[PDB]
Amino acid sequence: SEIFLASKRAAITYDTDPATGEPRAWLAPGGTGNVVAEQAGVLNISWIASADSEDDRRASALNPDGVTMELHSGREILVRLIRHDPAVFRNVQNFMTANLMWAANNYGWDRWTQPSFGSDAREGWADFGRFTRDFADAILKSSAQSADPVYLVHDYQLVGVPALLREQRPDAPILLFVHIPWPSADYWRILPKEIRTGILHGMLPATTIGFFADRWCRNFLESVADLLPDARIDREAMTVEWRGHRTRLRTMPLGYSPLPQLPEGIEEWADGHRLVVHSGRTDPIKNAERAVRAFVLAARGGGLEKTRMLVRMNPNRLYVPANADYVHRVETAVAEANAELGSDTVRIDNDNDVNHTIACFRRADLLIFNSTVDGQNLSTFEAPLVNERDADVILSETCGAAEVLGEYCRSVNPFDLVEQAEAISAALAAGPRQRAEAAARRRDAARPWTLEAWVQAQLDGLAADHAARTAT
Amino acid sequence: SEIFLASKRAAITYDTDPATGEPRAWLAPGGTGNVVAEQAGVLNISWIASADSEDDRRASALNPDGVTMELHSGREILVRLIRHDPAVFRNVQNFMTANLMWAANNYGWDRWTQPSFGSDAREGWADFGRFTRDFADAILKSSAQSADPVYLVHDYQLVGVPALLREQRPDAPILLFVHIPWPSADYWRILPKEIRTGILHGMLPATTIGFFADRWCRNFLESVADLLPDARIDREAMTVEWRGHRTRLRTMPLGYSPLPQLPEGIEEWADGHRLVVHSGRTDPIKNAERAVRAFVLAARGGGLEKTRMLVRMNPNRLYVPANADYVHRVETAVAEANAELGSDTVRIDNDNDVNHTIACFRRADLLIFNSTVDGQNLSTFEAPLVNERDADVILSETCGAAEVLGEYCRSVNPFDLVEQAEAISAALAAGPRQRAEAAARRRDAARPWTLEAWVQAQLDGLAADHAARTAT
Ligand SMILES: Nc1nc2c(ncn2[C@@H]2O[C@H](COP(=O)(O)OP(=O)(O)O)[C@@H](O)[C@H]2O)c(=O)[nH]1
Ligand SMILES: Nc1nc2c(ncn2[C@@H]2O[C@H](COP(=O)(O)OP(=O)(O)O)[C@@H](O)[C@H]2O)c(=O)[nH]1
Ligand SMILES: [Cl-]
Ligand SMILES: [Cl-]
């Protein structure tokens, strides 16, 4: 079985050997390609992604057809980076941020005042076409010798790719996985006509479309039914038929990859106190502002003396106005929490260190993952799995993760400050035994959903859907 | 057949007789009750609504059981106004504005930043319950003598009423009509748990729930399926079964009621120019800001010389921040349109004269009803029916009206400025013959949807659903 994996980025580490000083390049561990390469059915794999750095650009120019990279067990993966036109790639990246598509799939628009699509939306869509073509060409090039290529297409940026693959390769298995939500039909069609229909056209020729959650699958089907009068959907079978394409929709949850010190000052600042931890990158969906306001409402209700709150953020796309504004709104809430509850009750630690975040998970006496919406949210699996304080988890009901862990957490409406405040109070009032037992159940529910099982689900699902599509 | 009609307001005109000077109270023509009273099946009718004025309060106190009011043809209707506790009433009215429920059903929230429900949402919901109880009691009291009462409950404010009527009258036909949209399940859900489920609990005991549009019916069914695990929906039959209640959903479109001078300065200002007219009350859903920006994009494109634009607004609930902000955003756009295109290219006429609005409809060379969303939008039926300039209509695809007239207008995504600009230019470029022919088809499509046909649809639909509910 010859695998061709496309994703937006292939995590490649660039450095010099500490002994020789020679340039070396190596794949990061836990990479999707790495895991796929270890599966039993896989004879070989190539990984196609975008050059997004100067090192990537250089590497791509050095090895245009791709560079073979070694893995443990003597396994190898052919990694090919694509050098897009910079202005195009640059524009497509802004098309993918909360300036457009991110707001579209992650529910960022109020409709009354935003959005208002101008000529920029048309240019962005044109550029997205050129970007999609670049990927399709690279992927087909890489797989030109292969008799029965299997295509795995990951990431929202590559939604246009399946249709182009299918045009050249009518009988190939093609899986598209989308890692973010799919919005309601009424919300999806906020997008300009050529975008709202063109993205569906790009996706449907896949054999299999996977999302992290049932809700996303249903929303996707409703979008298809709403916009594509030629399309026939079946909500029980989770299938679309459209211009002879039969597409199967699947839910394939992911939880975590099985693969330290707290940030400076945090351990002493937190000592002698119960610690509420909210963690997520600097993205408005992570909902930290509301978490802080809820924490304040809870503290007004008392019992929350000797309780502090940490807002751990990983800076990301701060150049996008919605992101910078989110951080600004969070700072405001934190400043106001401190003013009201007393100094240093709430801290933000905003910083990119995965290890610091895991230490925060371990230290927490209460974990809050109260996203406005989330495609899945892996942090809510990771955190209970490493936490050794029997911390309760408050989980928003709109995280894809809630479909798996909702029953084992305090599931909340992420927009209700009162409901969230009451959950904070109850979580902190709960006794050691009750928390110990609930934590154990939570860890049991989270444990099975590993990166490897999720990869196996993709391969198995695609195989079954490939047989079905062939028969029909 | 003894009809009991409940709505939020019964339009009553209070004055003195110009000859005698004696106090006069008379039902406004074209009221819903008036029309229902004229239907063939109807033996008598009572109308229950809220006292919302000093005159109403006084009239209610004078005739607590209700006052018989004469209609043409010697028909009469018993009109009973309810005196609610003022603080409860005042708070329920704010619950019903864009501060809460209006944003819920008319898609006003971005989720990332709004809303954040606090204790006010809980108090608002408590007050809503007291208000709902007031209406149910008054309705039951008015109909206490009736052997087989038929209940027609109109307006969103009365969504809680059917359940209370059903508790006391298990076998009565009850229709609830909702005049505004129903949002996608993911969006409805934003609401606090006790509200999002409590409202469904209140509505479902109706025999029949009507909306102006299919899309609303579907979104309602999805909301039920999403939140009420006990409920069984059928999307083809348009039914819900829940706790022994069988509820039928129906689409019952309304267009217009079959029943002058332009505002000061408008005729002369508009003379020698083609006139683009956008009309709607001061509510963010009417989308005038975007209409103006689109007009500007179109005028940049040229051909739009000797073209002016009127933004006709009817001031409503200006005390609501969303509404005042909308008017503010519209002024800003108009000011900027003039600065760019030349002085006095665009005018706002903001003012409650309904005859004036009709004159604007008649004068228009192009009509724009580009709502972000609209329960139905009757203006888009009225305007082509009175227009005598063969004006094209630009209609948002998110108005319930688009399900009936969409094919006969220029249907647009209300969030796409470019698409809307291109429709403005094409509509103004089109020749007299093509417009004359399109206007005639438009008027033919609009004409059948009268107030009376809509009332007949309700009675017929309810009757059929009552038989069905009885059998099952
Ligand atoms: N690079 C980096 N990753 C982090 C940091 N903190 C947490 N993470 C990881 O980033 C991932 C976040 O994924 P998820 O919770 O699904 O939210 P997402 O960011 O929307 O994918 C988790 O695997 C976290 O363990 C950090 O400071 N830096
Ligand atoms: N009272 C009043 N009514 C108006 C005015 N202008 C238009 N109307 C009428 O108000 C109604 C507007 O209804 P519709 O277009 O469905 O939008 P709605 O305002 O959301 O109900 C139409 O019947 C118009 O003819 C005005 O200035 N004052
Ligand atoms: Cl929606
Ligand atoms: Cl939605």
Numbering used by the authors:
A (entry chain B), B (entry chain A): 4 to 262, 269 to 481
Task: Give the authors' words.
Our comparative bioinformatics studies suggest that among those reported as glycosyltransferases are also pseudo-glycosyltransferases (such as VldE, EC 2.x.x.x), which do not recognize sugars as substrates but rather catalyze the formation of non-glycosidic C-N bonds in the biosynthesis of C7N-aminocyclitol-containing natural products such as acarbose and validamycin A. Validoxylamine A is generated through the dephosphorylation of validoxylamine A 7′-phosphate by VldH while validoxylamine A 7′-phosphate (VDO) results from a condensation of GDP-valienol and validamine 7-phosphate (both are pseudo-sugars) by the pseudo-glycosyltransferase, VldE. Similar to OtsA, VldE is comprised of two Rossman β/α/β domains which are oriented in a GT-B configuration.
The GDP bound structure of VldE (VldE•GDP) described here is also in an “open” conformation and the binding of GDP did not have an effect on the global conformation of the apo enzyme (RMSD Cα = 0.350 Å). Within VldE, the ribose and phosphate moieties of GDP make interactions with the side-chains of the residues Arg290, Lys 295 and Glu391; as well as with the backbone atoms of residues Leu387 and Ser388. The α-phosphate of GDP does make a single unique interaction with Ser388 within VldE. This interaction is not possible within OtsA as there is a valine at the same position. The preference of guanine by VldE is mediated by these three hydrophilic residues, while the preference for a uracil moiety is mediated by three hydrophobic residues at the same positions. Within OtsA, the uracil is surrounded by the hydrophobic residues Ile295, Pro297, and Leu344. The preference of a GDP activated donor sugar by VldE (instead of UDP) is immediately apparent when comparing the catalytic site to that of OtsA. The conserved position of the β-phosphate of GDP is critically important because the bond between this phosphate and the donated cyclitol is broken during the transfer to the acceptor.
